[PDB]
Design a protein around this ligand. Sequence first.
Ligand SMILES: O=S(=O)(O)c1cc2c(O)c(c1)Sc1cc(S(=O)(=O)O)cc(c1O)Sc1cc(S(=O)(=O)O)cc(c1O)Sc1cc(S(=O)(=O)O)cc(c1O)S2
Ligand SMILES: O=S(=O)(O)c1cc2c(O)c(c1)Sc1cc(S(=O)(=O)O)cc(c1O)Sc1cc(S(=O)(=O)O)cc(c1O)Sc1cc(S(=O)(=O)O)cc(c1O)S2
Ligand SMILES: O=S(=O)(O)c1cc2c(O)c(c1)Sc1cc(S(=O)(=O)O)cc(c1O)Sc1cc(S(=O)(=O)O)cc(c1O)Sc1cc(S(=O)(=O)O)cc(c1O)S2
Ligand SMILES: O=S(=O)(O)c1cc2c(O)c(c1)Sc1cc(S(=O)(=O)O)cc(c1O)Sc1cc(S(=O)(=O)O)cc(c1O)Sc1cc(S(=O)(=O)O)cc(c1O)S2
Ligand SMILES: O=S(=O)(O)c1cc2c(O)c(c1)Sc1cc(S(=O)(=O)O)cc(c1O)Sc1cc(S(=O)(=O)O)cc(c1O)Sc1cc(S(=O)(=O)O)cc(c1O)S2
Ligand SMILES: O=S(=O)(O)c1cc2c(O)c(c1)Sc1cc(S(=O)(=O)O)cc(c1O)Sc1cc(S(=O)(=O)O)cc(c1O)Sc1cc(S(=O)(=O)O)cc(c1O)S2
Ligand code: HEC
Ligand code: HEC
Ligand code: HEC
Ligand code: HEC
Ligand SMILES: [Zn+2]
Ligand SMILES: [Zn+2]
Ligand SMILES: [Zn+2]
Ligand SMILES: [Zn+2]
Ligand SMILES: [Zn+2]
Ligand SMILES: [Zn+2]
Ligand SMILES: [Zn+2]
Ligand SMILES: [Zn+2]
Ligand SMILES: [Zn+2]
Ligand SMILES: [Zn+2]
Ligand SMILES: [Zn+2]
Ligand SMILES: [Zn+2]
Ligand SMILES: [Zn+2]
Ligand SMILES: [Zn+2]
Ligand SMILES: [Zn+2]
Ligand SMILES: [Zn+2]
Ligand SMILES: [Zn+2]
Ligand SMILES: [Zn+2]
Ligand SMILES: [Zn+2]
Ligand SMILES: [Zn+2]
Ligand SMILES: [Zn+2]
Ligand SMILES: [Zn+2]
Ligand SMILES: [Zn+2]
Ligand SMILES: [Zn+2]
Ligand SMILES: [Zn+2]
Ligand SMILES: [Zn+2]
Ligand SMILES: [Zn+2]
Lengths: 107, 107, 107, 107
Amino acid sequence: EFKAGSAKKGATLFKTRCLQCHTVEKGGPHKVGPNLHGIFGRHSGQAEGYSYTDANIKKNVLWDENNMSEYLTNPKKYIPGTKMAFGGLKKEKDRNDLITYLKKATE
Amino acid sequence: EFKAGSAKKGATLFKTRCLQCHTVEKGGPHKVGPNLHGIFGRHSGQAEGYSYTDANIKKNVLWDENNMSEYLTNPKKYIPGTKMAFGGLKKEKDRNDLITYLKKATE
Amino acid sequence: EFKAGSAKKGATLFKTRCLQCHTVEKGGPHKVGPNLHGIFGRHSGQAEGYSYTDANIKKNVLWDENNMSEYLTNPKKYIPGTKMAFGGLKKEKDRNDLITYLKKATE
Amino acid sequence: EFKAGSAKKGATLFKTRCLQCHTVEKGGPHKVGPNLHGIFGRHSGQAEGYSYTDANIKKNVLWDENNMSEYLTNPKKYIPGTKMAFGGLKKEKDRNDLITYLKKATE
Ligand SMILES: O=S(=O)(O)c1cc2c(O)c(c1)Sc1cc(S(=O)(=O)O)cc(c1O)Sc1cc(S(=O)(=O)O)cc(c1O)Sc1cc(S(=O)(=O)O)cc(c1O)S2
Ligand SMILES: O=S(=O)(O)c1cc2c(O)c(c1)Sc1cc(S(=O)(=O)O)cc(c1O)Sc1cc(S(=O)(=O)O)cc(c1O)Sc1cc(S(=O)(=O)O)cc(c1O)S2
Ligand SMILES: O=S(=O)(O)c1cc2c(O)c(c1)Sc1cc(S(=O)(=O)O)cc(c1O)Sc1cc(S(=O)(=O)O)cc(c1O)Sc1cc(S(=O)(=O)O)cc(c1O)S2
Ligand SMILES: O=S(=O)(O)c1cc2c(O)c(c1)Sc1cc(S(=O)(=O)O)cc(c1O)Sc1cc(S(=O)(=O)O)cc(c1O)Sc1cc(S(=O)(=O)O)cc(c1O)S2
Ligand SMILES: O=S(=O)(O)c1cc2c(O)c(c1)Sc1cc(S(=O)(=O)O)cc(c1O)Sc1cc(S(=O)(=O)O)cc(c1O)Sc1cc(S(=O)(=O)O)cc(c1O)S2
Ligand SMILES: O=S(=O)(O)c1cc2c(O)c(c1)Sc1cc(S(=O)(=O)O)cc(c1O)Sc1cc(S(=O)(=O)O)cc(c1O)Sc1cc(S(=O)(=O)O)cc(c1O)S2
Ligand code: HEC
Ligand code: HEC
Ligand code: HEC
Ligand code: HEC
Ligand SMILES: [Zn+2]
Ligand SMILES: [Zn+2]
Ligand SMILES: [Zn+2]
Ligand SMILES: [Zn+2]
Ligand SMILES: [Zn+2]
Ligand SMILES: [Zn+2]
Ligand SMILES: [Zn+2]
Ligand SMILES: [Zn+2]
Ligand SMILES: [Zn+2]
Ligand SMILES: [Zn+2]
Ligand SMILES: [Zn+2]
Ligand SMILES: [Zn+2]
Ligand SMILES: [Zn+2]
Ligand SMILES: [Zn+2]
Ligand SMILES: [Zn+2]
Ligand SMILES: [Zn+2]
Ligand SMILES: [Zn+2]
Ligand SMILES: [Zn+2]
Ligand SMILES: [Zn+2]
Ligand SMILES: [Zn+2]
Ligand SMILES: [Zn+2]
Ligand SMILES: [Zn+2]
Ligand SMILES: [Zn+2]
Ligand SMILES: [Zn+2]
Ligand SMILES: [Zn+2]
Ligand SMILES: [Zn+2]
Ligand SMILES: [Zn+2]
């Protein structure tokens, strides 16, 4: 389901839809949401120093491009009970582009 | 998000995937499943003389082309506890073709 | 043209699409379908103690990953007359994952 | 299932793998195979002036991009007894490119 898209558009989607709550850089600070560096290949709810809902820990997924796409389609449906206040990215090209940027920004 | 496809292809899809349990002709007989004539524009679980599950009755949808496509994607997810033994047409062209045929067959 | 995939999601596919009729572990019970331990590398229809159809027996193939994926694409096409009532896994990444799991659980 | 590919790329496929037996332009001449101008949207076995196997005529398909693709994968499997001596384009992107060229050259 995930196909690599445009990192450049993905960077703008993040600025307007996520940066509000998240930083991406290594060592960056948690805000409302956790810092996201190294999120791919990591278990849900494990960023150091961030205090998660139990449902984000207990979802128990190893983040990759595909379950990230599914999550960002509808976060509170993929993880019922999350404090991530965000409706979701409905359009699949917006998802591929954002995940393309996010991979590059967080690896 | 339903779109008219091939009724000839839908007829074939129907002969091979639905015909076992279903008829389409006006006043046709029930089999394992209810005869389907007049289904579009009727409430669910309302073919005369057929014993549905309570779930199929209480679902309380009015069949049109779009929620029919949603139903045929994963019938047990759309109507939990339905006794229809069918995995689903996962491909969208197949659902468009079948619904194109089915609308012509049952109207 | 099998390529290794995710045993973990192949596990998930097995219990949703196969477990109702099959067990996998060594010495496991026959149910509707035969216990499958040791399937890869055996001729078809050779699980001791299971009562097969003539067609599944006379098919005369040695199961590997490849012809298994052909079979699971359309079981009744590959073995005309089989009493396994299963439509098939149409998508290759689904068969890939399931076969990767099945091979690990049956070897 | 068909996806528009590269007409140019497909043009090179046709010269190497088809032109030996076929021509494409309006009014083009018959060779070993028939001239293919107007093939899409026409019944099988109809090109005016060519002598087809009865197998080709009785396949009774109206050619579009997708049953063309199916066909060119395995001609003898699609039309048993055809007199077209061509093993098939096994790679999916080769069929997409060729059909994309063929649509443009024969419409
Ligand atoms: O494969 S990708 O689609 O991901 C992709 C990645 C890059 C890339 O160049 C392209 C396509 S091709 C391209 C597409 C578009 S367009 O499609 O947007 O019109 C405009 C241009 C352009 O060259 S010109 C331009 C415009 C702007 S802007 O005025 O600030 O928008 C900034 C930069 C720039 O060169 S600098 C700049 C800024 C970033 S960023 O992501 O950090 O913002 C990335 C890159 C940059 O070069 S690499
Ligand atoms: O059931 S739960 O989803 O709650 C769940 C159970 C377990 C677990 O660790 C986790 C989640 S956390 C997690 C979630 C996801 S996921 O979000 O992508 O699904 C992927 C991974 C991951 O670590 S990485 C991984 C990848 C693969 S591979 O794909 O086959 O190569 C095999 C294993 C493995 O760990 S091994 C392995 C195999 C299985 S079983 O299902 O095959 O029996 C179970 C376990 C394993 O450790 S316990
Ligand atoms: O934001 S939502 O996730 O809620 C969401 C709701 C709807 C929607 O179209 C989308 C996303 S877009 C979408 C996203 C994803 S994914 O990225 O999440 O993988 C996969 C798909 C997909 O199409 S494919 C698919 C898979 C299944 S499955 O058999 O259950 O797997 C059933 C249906 C289906 O289309 S049918 C279906 C059934 C229902 S419901 O009423 O029965 O719940 C609602 C809808 C349906 O389309 S509207
Ligand atoms: O459920 S079904 O098994 O029936 C089934 C039907 C179709 C389908 O796509 C699939 C499964 S999925 C699939 C499964 C397998 S597998 O089973 O071998 O692993 C291989 C392939 C593949 O794509 S690649 C392939 C290989 C060959 S080969 O050269 O003969 O080997 C010919 C064709 C072809 O596509 S052509 C071809 C010819 C016809 S027909 O109408 O002329 O019979 C129909 C179809 C064709 O694709 S639709
Ligand atoms: O199909 S036809 O062979 O009749 C044909 C079509 C077109 C065309 O201009 C010509 C011949 S004339 C010509 C002949 C030869 S050659 O004889 O030496 O090979 C080389 C060139 C060239 O210009 S240069 C060139 C080389 C390549 S390459 O093959 O990828 O390296 C791609 C393109 C390109 O411009 S871009 C390109 C991409 C496409 S599409 O189909 O991918 O959308 C179509 C066209 C393109 O120009 S129209
Ligand atoms: O808009 S639609 O896409 O729905 C559509 C509806 C019709 C239609 O003609 C077409 C497209 S165009 C077409 C497409 C295909 S193909 O796509 O299958 O290759 C083959 C042909 C063909 O002419 S030739 C042919 C083949 C056969 S067959 O040997 O029995 O298959 C029966 C008939 C027939 O003419 S008679 C026949 C049987 C039926 S049915 O529904 O009762 O099976 C419908 C029709 C018939 O004329 S109307
Ligand atoms: C504020 C309203 C936020 C918006 C905008 C975005 N995110 Fe978020 N996110 C937020 C919180 C408070 C949390 C923790 C959730 C919990 O239940 O504890 C999250 C979580 C995530 C995660 C999971 C991180 C992990 O498991 O370690 C991801 C991958 C994530 N968020 C991504 C993400 C994206 C891509 C966003 C833009 C589309 C986005 N978030 C916006 C708060 C907020
Ligand atoms: C036997 C295993 C069946 C297959 C094959 C198909 N259908 Fe079915 N259908 C079946 C049953 C037993 C029921 C009643 C379920 C209940 O819970 O009461 C149904 C129901 C439907 C309906 C709803 C009719 C209504 O009045 O609400 C529809 C629209 C329907 N079935 C369509 C359908 C299609 C399109 C099929 C081929 C893809 C198909 N069915 C196959 C049994 C079986
Ligand atoms: C019940 C409806 C079943 C489902 C679900 C699955 N299988 Fe099946 N299988 C079933 C039966 C009754 C038989 C015997 C077939 C016969 O004709 O006698 C089988 C057979 C197999 C085999 C062949 C075993 C052999 O020794 O050759 C295989 C490899 C097999 N089944 C695999 C399989 C898979 C992978 C399934 C999930 C995708 C699956 N089966 C489901 C009954 C049923
Ligand atoms: C010589 C070995 C050929 C090669 C190379 C190609 N084609 Fe062919 N084709 C050939 C013959 C002798 C026939 C008639 C077969 C019969 O049974 O009568 C055909 C037929 C076709 C058709 C069908 C035409 C119709 O009117 O329905 C098509 C669409 C076709 N051929 C296409 C085609 C393509 C795309 C080729 C390159 C991959 C190709 N042919 C090569 C002889 C030969
Ligand atoms: Zn998708
Ligand atoms: Zn989907
Ligand atoms: Zn650049
Ligand atoms: Zn650039
Ligand atoms: Zn630590
Ligand atoms: Zn793991
Ligand atoms: Zn784990
Ligand atoms: Zn959708
Ligand atoms: Zn890093
Ligand atoms: Zn859709
Ligand atoms: Zn017609
Ligand atoms: Zn849907
Ligand atoms: Zn869908
Ligand atoms: Zn009527
Ligand atoms: Zn393949
Ligand atoms: Zn593990
Ligand atoms: Zn296929
Ligand atoms: Zn063993
Ligand atoms: Zn394909
Ligand atoms: Zn050009
Ligand atoms: Zn050019
Ligand atoms: Zn017609
Ligand atoms: Zn016709
Ligand atoms: Zn094919
Ligand atoms: Zn096919
Ligand atoms: Zn294929
Ligand atoms: Zn023309």
